Amino acid sequence: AFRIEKDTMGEVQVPADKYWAAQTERSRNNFKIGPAASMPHEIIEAFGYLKKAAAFANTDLGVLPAEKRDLIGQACDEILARKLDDQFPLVIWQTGSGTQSNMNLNEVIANRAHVINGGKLGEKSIIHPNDDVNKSQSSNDTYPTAMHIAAYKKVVEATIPAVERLQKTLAAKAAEFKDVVKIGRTHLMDATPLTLGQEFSGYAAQLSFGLTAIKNTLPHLRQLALGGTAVGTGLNTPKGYDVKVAEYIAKFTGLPFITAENKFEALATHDAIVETHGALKQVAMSLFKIANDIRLLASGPRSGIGEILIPENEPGSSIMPGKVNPTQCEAMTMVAAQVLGNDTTISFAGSQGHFELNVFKPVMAANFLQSAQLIADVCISFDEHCATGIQPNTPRIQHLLDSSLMLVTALNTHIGYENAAKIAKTAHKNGTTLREEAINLGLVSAEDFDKWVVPADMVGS
Template sequence: MTDEFRIEKDSLGEVRVPAAAYWGAQTQRAIHNFPITGLRPYPAFVWSMTLIKRAAAEVNNDLSLFNAKEVAGRAISGEQMAAAIIQAGDEILAGGYADQFVVDPIQAGAGTSHNMNINEVMANRANEILGFGLGEKGKPVNPNDHVNMAQSTNDTIPTAIRLGALWRLDELLATLERLATELRRKAQEFDGIVKSGRTHLQDAVPVRLGQEFAAYARAVERDADKIRESAAGLRRLGIGGTATGTGLNAHPEYHRRMVDVIGRISGLELFESDDLFESMQSMADAVHFSGALRTLAQDLTRIANDFRLLASGPTTGLDEIRLPPVQPGSSIMPGKVNPVLAEMLNMAMFQVMGNDLTVMLAGQAGQLELNVMMPIIAFNLFQSMDVIINAVNSFIDNCVVGITANAEKATGWLAKNAILVTALNPVIGYQKGAEVAKEALATNRTVREVVIEKGYITGEEADQLLDVSALTEGGIQGVAAGG
């Protein structure tokens, strides 16, 4: 070993590894082979893979599967090796050694490089705990034989995808609950403001601004429910299937014990798979969960678009709401302020929708006993959750809580809205109503003025039938309830 590197070996031969690195030969080969994006695995992936390894060490030790070794005159018991692996895992779960997980998300199929990166780091840290240096020969804990005992890339990676999504599920749902709560607060604040509804981007019958915002809140709540429901399938773990689903090289009790231990350590509600082959062949649960994230993304895109429309102008647009001015909007036009948080949310949700397409395509690309596209499924799924959480929190803090209503503009547009005549249909009929609307538009007068002038109803009747607040509550104008 030199000051710069040490020599590590794998089944293909010797590899130079940075002297201070906790990874080994297979990770170093992946660094060389896959310089694709410059990105690293998400913390959710490192956490979930480490959790699996840490739990496996406990389970395999309880099953008396660790054998003692003698190294450099030292007797190392199986219990000592297991304890060292468990300690290394606990340190990583607590956030340690994060800089040691270095394999690009776009890599060899299935995620063997990811798996070996975890195995090598945990093995080297376990050996260090046992008193052996990184470059020391004959270290007792082996990445494959001990850290990876009773495991395969083929069952750890799909299990990690499930656990990593569940790890941040509560945080994601809490973020959406916060967004819905803030939208409902705005709904209450704006409930007294009656404005023009719009369909086809054309004038429609009146609504209250509060009703629009309450609908946004309800949409977010429903999308959160869909995400919660879709996550149920992720709780079914296939760990213990090893290479193809048969469980070869795993103790018969390993699967059951692993689900119990992972659940205990993580605090997650987890279940045993009812078919280990299906749990390894199919990525449908991850695809389903990603689809629920996409459904949320399209709703948030729609809401962001509405905010941009409602705030458009201000002098030549709708200008019914005002978004907080958080930064100058132009490098050339002084005083311009743009709806930057709504634009950010649009872009973030487009990313989530694109990620979902990748997950769907990768999910259907599995063949026979394995889906080799799991690394990109994991990366895109975890990125989608990360993007949603961060984007929505910023949208809440920097936009939603500071929205104000421009009641004067909203009610001003409504006063000019000829579609108010719809409320008169039960009294004067559709044809006369169309006649009134056309004349009101052509002469730039109000519906009230025209309908009274034509003698279709009196002024008193017009005031009653065209009460815009009453129109937002539904019902048939001019007809008593139950009449």
């Protein structure tokens, strides 16, 4: 049922059918914390790319035979094609450098290479997990490299396109609604007019600024630690490895990775993760506000605001029959709340490096990838199932527009602030219209009032 594998600390019984070896099995047993195998699959995929890249670079620089490169490459291709997912059983909550997941890659690739070459599991592998699979490497540069590959891939392939898709919908709605005049609200109180398209133009601008803020963070994020080995010096790397291995990662992923400018910064900190996550959090706070506005505007349908109609996707209540809720808005606001807490966790962890190494790598990686993924997923969901189908509730908009006492603001440059205030305050106290009191107070003729107070003329242009 078990076979014997060895590391420098002794013999370990390993499930006889699994490709991992002693150090993986120790970690599996010694860190029973949270759900099994919680290390993000994106980190394992990133490891497949960088272990293949290291083997290719080592062979080009004359320190690894091509025959060993090809076996390592084949095992990495299998990991990448999702053939060995059950060979990675380790948790986030392991050593803070990710040594144990690095050794999980090294052990699985070594044993699987042995079988690819015609051997049997339980035999000494032709490929050594440390001397061959890990040649010219440490956990300390490989794990950060996996974090930046996985982070950068998710942001450019998932998060940015999802935010762009929603931004384009909001901008399309701003144009669709450019002639719908509604009442502004400030402090939640009745204000002066704006178009529903103007209001949506603010949401669209928020996401355009957010996109720029995320993209600004990509030059730091594309920098890879690989080549810094144990402490950042590149001890035991061949001359030129740092640039050559970054070039192979860029080729295999199709993404613009470069070697990190300062390998001490790249090991002792995750400042690039802090930087990019700050921009994800900025987008999340903007999305919170947009979602919250859309549910306020949709509130009702009879006893709220009710200025917009949203798609009705599912029953909203188990007890209130026929109720429908702004449930896509709720998912977005909850995802935003999660991203803010993830920012606390990443910022705290990012302060806590000691000397040559930040040992909070897995918790920073898992929180980062959750934020990037959930922002991408909820932007797509919100776009598909809410934002694309928003329409005005025109009769309700018109009533709420004509009802505002703060249409009196149009009179300021004709009669002055104090006189205009007396009209609005008198209408409020009496339950009357602005026009009725402008006339009764002797402050504006009926004729001037009708010329001077026109909501369609109060929206700029």
